[PDB]
Each structure stands twice: as structure tokens, then as C-alpha cells.
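In the previous chapter we treated chains in isolation. Here, by contrast, the input contains two separate entities that must be folded as one system, with a combined length of 181 residues.
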Amino acid sequence: KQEAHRALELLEDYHARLSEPQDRALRIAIERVIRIFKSRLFQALLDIQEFYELTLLDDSKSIQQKTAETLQIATKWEKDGQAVKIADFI
Amino acid sequence: KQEAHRALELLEDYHARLSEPQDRALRIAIERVIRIFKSRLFQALLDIQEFYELTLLDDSKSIQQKTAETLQIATKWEKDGQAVKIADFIK
């Protein structure tokens, strides 16, 4: 139970088993959750891809510079639980 | 290539090839990226697990109430997905 790596798998399976017409509104709402979650995951993975490209693959940057940039990215992620993040900002 | 689903794999491979002593500080910094990224993914997965438990598994909630809750969590997560950081507080 509650194997974190399976969380999305289980949500998808719950969706698949929701096949009665009186349950259809819930089914469509869960599809929206699934889409939104996979978009979050995709953006996270692009954070890695963009770091890999801007920093690690750029042979013009010194090891020192690459190290600094590498530390900076992880610090941002580490601080996100205490971050003030404003939806639909100016 | 840049296939998103393999982005962490490629980073793991770069780490593995970064074996010279002058590059060791960068290797250790990359270990920290990998650790922190995995924590981010775990926490995201727990956001699903927590919704699944609280809403979908609770047979005492009507389909209507589960639907309402599911819609609200999508609205919230959509706002979160585009929110911009302005500050963080120590602690």
C-alpha cells in the first residue's frame, strides 16, 4: 500500500475502473488532475534538461562556474517549501 | 535528443563519467541536484497519494462530493503550476 512511486499508476487505474455513466463527471475531473500532474512532472524534467544544456554541456564554462550553477539550482529547489510563490502575478 | 523522460538518466550518466579529481567538486554538487530532485518528485507523488486517500478512497463521500474535491485540487494545482517565486523565508 501507499507505494509512492505507484501513486500515479493507482490514480490512472481508479480512472479506468470508473465506467458507470453516473460516475462520468468524476471520471472527467480525475482526467483533468492526471493531465495537470503530468504537466508538472514534465516541467520538472525540463528543469533538469535545461540545466544539463545551459550548464553542463557548455564547454565554455569553467568547472568552477559549472559547480556554482549546479549548487544554485539545487538551493532553489531546496528553498521552495519556504517560498512565497504568487499565482497569476503581474 | 533531449527526451524529457530521460532527462534524469542523462544527468546520472554525466555524473558517472565525471571521474577526474579536479572535477570532484562538480560531481558532488551534481549528487546534491540528484538527491534534491528525487525529493521533489517524491513530494509530488505524495500530493497524489494524499488526494487519493482523502478523497477517492473514502466510500463515505458521495460521487458529487468527490467530484467537487477533485475539481478544487485541479484548480489549486493549475495555479501552483504557474505561480512565480518572489521570496523565501529562512527556516
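Residues 21 and 27 of chain B are 9 Å apart (CA to CA). The beta strands of chain B are 84-88. Compare these points with the single-chain example from earlier in the chapter.
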